[model samples]
Target: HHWGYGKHNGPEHWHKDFPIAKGERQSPVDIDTHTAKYDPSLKPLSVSYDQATSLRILNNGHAFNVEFDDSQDKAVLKGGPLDGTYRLIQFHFHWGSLDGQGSEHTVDKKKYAAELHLVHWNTKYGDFGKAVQQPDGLAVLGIFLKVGSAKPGLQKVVDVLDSIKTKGKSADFTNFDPRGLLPESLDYWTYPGSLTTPPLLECVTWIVLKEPISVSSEQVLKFRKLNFNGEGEPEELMVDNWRPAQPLKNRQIKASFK
Candidate 1:
């Protein structure tokens, strides 16, 4: 594999192939909550998810993601620092080997057990490739996950991991509404950033929620057990798939609520 979260080819080594990784506005930046400014103009996020749009779950060699049918706006997000609607493409998670830490974006040095990335693409462009070419082409919703009682909203997602335990493996996963997993607050911190993985294009608008959703310890274990390597390849556990927070680098963090 070109990259894995190992000592050999993790985030540190990604720049060798993807120089944009070190570019300005790279994602998963640590949020200095005290320094984040409140902007009343940032509207509440608008989300309308159609359960029938869910497609499948698969290991994209980085994380296990449940993809959605985005041929149209069956599931979409708008507002909250965005000018137009963004269609949901897929949603995935980044978890730790243990409960101490695993989240990509941290707050004042605090880490959660995991983080959920709900990826969406801008509709202003005619196609996804065009969207990827622009800095504001993508809009990703980041939700922090803490260990607690089992969250029924997320249980179905974890339940499908067994079918996609290794790289290059995927299974039919449908009829799931991603909005059910969101926290109680629509308020979030917004900034321009890139994807947290290799070929990390600087084309993402990050909307990270202040509050978190709860997941059980056992659910996180299922994530850790997934293999970065495909079957018959050198097997490796898929833990800490998260990239450490990047330098905020001349970007201002804006909040929707004071």
Candidate 2:
């Protein structure tokens, strides 16, 4: 069965098949900043992105993903709670039906308009599929999105949404720099968590940013234009594609900045 955001097949029902959904280190957990310990040793994040490595963008039934060619070490993430360089594979988003509710991870129990995830895999693991099963295999950078001024860099991504409206559709999206989507501050909260999807692997080292980037209200609505169904299937508007926060059992969230 396909996992989705429907009434019967949402996150709450994922555990029926993907038992790991209820595992000890599930993702999208609420980040309580008031209690997070400040770590002075955390290094500043280093992002090295090569615009040439951006391959294409597509709609994969779950969300619209901007894929990167990780063949070589052109685009890589280093420092900031990571031991080794992690290669960027793809970036995707999760949002809500409206402007008020969408983001996966919340700050002090507050939800943002949406959330962005830049998925990277450790080079030592050899491949992304293999890396996702190990303890320190995957490193995900999470950024929150708020409804405000439209982000210029994000507009490039939004403009291509219509082209890949249906599932399995894709288009060449070159020379786009994702770094522009990042906030000025690299301050974040780090923790160990699982993927928020089915086959929820507990291999992610989540680095969630404290500051949120801004997106216009119109831009937020554009994301809803996507469809979860394929071309000939009954159209299902793709919105509220985020998983709820899980219990932060036996975990400590470390802050990069005080």
Candidate 3:
């Protein structure tokens, strides 16, 4: 049962139709996105910090996404003895309708306060240009972010948010280690799936971490402060910018080290 990409279309339908969606291992998992779980088997090859990579910030007037250029950064993805090798491409995020909560992946039918996505491609298959077209040629790491007392480790991302504070406005960021923004756990839940975006490329290995990072309520609110296209009046803030949970069909989810 192949499903198209849409707010209502996702692994939920995949699960509703396949039943296997309830497997012990699934993606957009209800876990924290940290570095503590960084096992040798699932370790990244190289984590670039503020490396000078081409960054493109976009605005659909819904949320912001930053895409990196191909053949640029040499960050490596050191994987398990058996897992495939990969490399970092571009990392972006998805959010809800409000600052408090709104993400596509849910647990026990409950939504996490927020979500983040650090996209990667199978270097063996080439960059997103060639890899995005093949099945099992992409690897996307999913991280959950929630509002808490302490500011989330994502301050690096937010600290620079002011530069591109407005929507449709983008700039290149250099010498930054996005991996540092990650939480402390490396434990992850993985599965086969499609892109949450249009064309919903299904050639992806969705890797969702089990630990969520922390962000202050104020910081979460700051995401909503992003605006685009409203030149005169106070800009239309980017409050909740996320997709609803998708359906999980017959595909089975697997944990690399579990």
Candidate 4:
């Protein structure tokens, strides 16, 4: 597909097919802390998850997705710029081939080693398909992954990289809870944006966390091991799976702090 991260099909070329790529509210916007307006009304985000619902992890030639059983609201995100409940659908990571880069959104133009996105769909929209097109249909909780101490929280997912080594492969990945990956502080900057990847629909309420979680350089290396190529295609590493920050336009990023 033209959406792959290759040079010919990269983000810069997305405008050819998805004209909305240049439209208002594109995602991965740089979070300029100095400019973000502190909104006292924005509530701290509430998150709750059921371990059993973490169904499986798969590689779709772009990035690995740890999909959840979103049949119910067992895993949910609410408050903080959200009008209603959003059920957890899946989570994935974006990282650089090397350290010091690869986060989709930058903090004052400073890049982190990686970024984690916990995707959720609004139950008010009935399902994921319908929600993706709504104005307030989806919510994404973004967590920056800094290279520091080894993240015990990340080890569970890291251990399974080889199990789903190439695109179109998956394994039963259960008994894990994403809450373990969250930082203690829920403080975040909220804004309206689109899905960072292709289809690039502008429907997400992005909640980028203030604090970062730690993962070692070696741990991040494991993620790159996944082959983005199909079982029959030439092997290509799945590193740098991120979209560069788009224009801010008329959008205002609201901080949940003063």
Candidate 5:
């Protein structure tokens, strides 16, 4: 329960507990598009979401996460390198202490200000916990974030930060569609990888969008205000909550767009 981004207990140290941290299909890789294969057969991704399923938002000591109700297929992901439908379970972000860099996945060696992760689990696997143990269990959609004009849709998420500013804090967050947070283009790169956090299971098929979405500098600052500690605990700013990009090994990155 105390794993975090620190010198003693960060990503480098996760391997001690989660052996898959050093696996071949580890995630948050540096996506070099020039070398990635352009696969024409890769189908366009399909995302169906319902704002009604948005349950709540919480500060999980590591990052602020927005959870969705996945008891049914109210929100689902289909196609795009997937063999079956995946249910949207939750979404979260990884940001930096400063705006210079913090994204987990880098493109062409360039790091973005932050990154958004939309996590999903395959329906065939029964549940997220079980899905994490299978080869084709999860699908994570990664979106890059840059500083600029305030994305209106993002303001909704930003507005709720005050309520869940400290770790373990949670607030009712309903009727907000996750799709509004995505960029104009859905073009992405696909590769088999694992969860970036501890229990780094190699069950994810990463679908990282090529285009980035905009967030104001002020909005980006709001994320840093979140604390990694709970009430009455020594406060630690939740910054640079991103793992360094892992080696790709022999895996081939496939592009959905030319």
Candidate 6:
């Protein structure tokens, strides 16, 4: 679960702890005619990853965001882990108060049950915090959700979701591979924009996966049960934790191998 795309990870706490992140670009946008302006002359080489790589899962006690060290020579995305080598710093989810729906990025004003963002950093600049300042600096892969039967690919992750049901109640999770969670193809939809949150820095290259990963109706209900506010109060229940969809402001959208 990529959590630090600089979106809805306790925005209040984030601004207090790492105030700088609040200044970076955010995501979850609507695409109309926003298209890529140019194409790279030589496309980046294809690649894959292994378990030896750093796969960290931070329950956050509130939300779960996984981090992977793509600094390794093999953590390649099209090209090697250089210039455009983005480490899977972390990945997480955003849910609502009810089982029916609670995500931000909508298609024609329609939101799904949930949304999973896989945050990555372009090694070209530096770390996730620094690189996200450039127009093409950061890459946030997005996955949409629909209220449906459990997806075979996500069956493994769902088994562990129950462990972190309560806010600030998280357990250690490792050795969990991330390949299966990714959509069937590496192909994606790209765009340039800021994060979907405040202090919104316009420094993101979004890749919203066309295909979506599924979750069982029960699993989704459990996610909605999370409480963003640390206080153990019913009012703190994470009901509709999504940021309102923002205007395009005339942005450009691109795709991988489209």
Cα lDDT tens digits, model 2, 1-258, are 678888899999999989999899999899998999999999988878754378899999999999998888878888999999899999999999988889999999999999999999999999999999798999999999999999988999999999999999999988789888899898999999989888899999999999899999989889999999999899899999999999999999999998
lDDT of each: 0.88, 0.92, 0.59, 0.91, 0.92, 0.59
Model 1 scores worst on lDDT over the 10 consecutive residues at: 46-55
The sequence of per-residue lDDT tens digits that candidate 4 reaches over residues 1-258 is: 668788888899998899999989999899999999999999989887754288899988899999999997799999988988999999999998889788999999999999999999999999999999997999999999999889887899999989888888999998787878998899999999999988999999999999999998889989988888878788899988888999999899999987
lDDT of 3 by residue, 1-258 (tens): 244223454434545554534443234433232312334344432334344353555554445666555575465444532255566776766665564566656654567677777777777776677887877677777777777765445665676677676645676665455666577766666667766654455667776666778778776766766774434556555654454555454544544443
TM-score of each predicted structure versus truth = 0.97, 0.98, 0.72, 0.98, 0.98, 0.73
**Per-residue lDDT of model 5, residues 179-226, tens digit only:** 789898989999999999988889999999999999999999999998
- For model 6 the local lDDT of residue 41 reads 39
**Candidate 2: Cα lDDT at 142:** 96
The model with the greater TM-score, 4 or 6, is 4
Residue 159 deviation, candidate 4, in Å? 1.0
Q: Kindly list the per-residue Cα lDDT of model 6 for residues 9-102, writing each as its tens digit.
A: 5444445544544342345665432354334432433435464244545445445676566665444354411245665666777776665566
List candidate 3 stretches off by more than 4 Å: 1-60, 67-69, 78-83, 151-153, 228-235, 256-258
Give the range where candidate 2 is weakest over 10 consecutive residues by summed lDDT. 46-55
* Model 2 TM-score, 2 decimals: 0.98
How displaced is residue 125 in candidate 3, in Å? 2.6
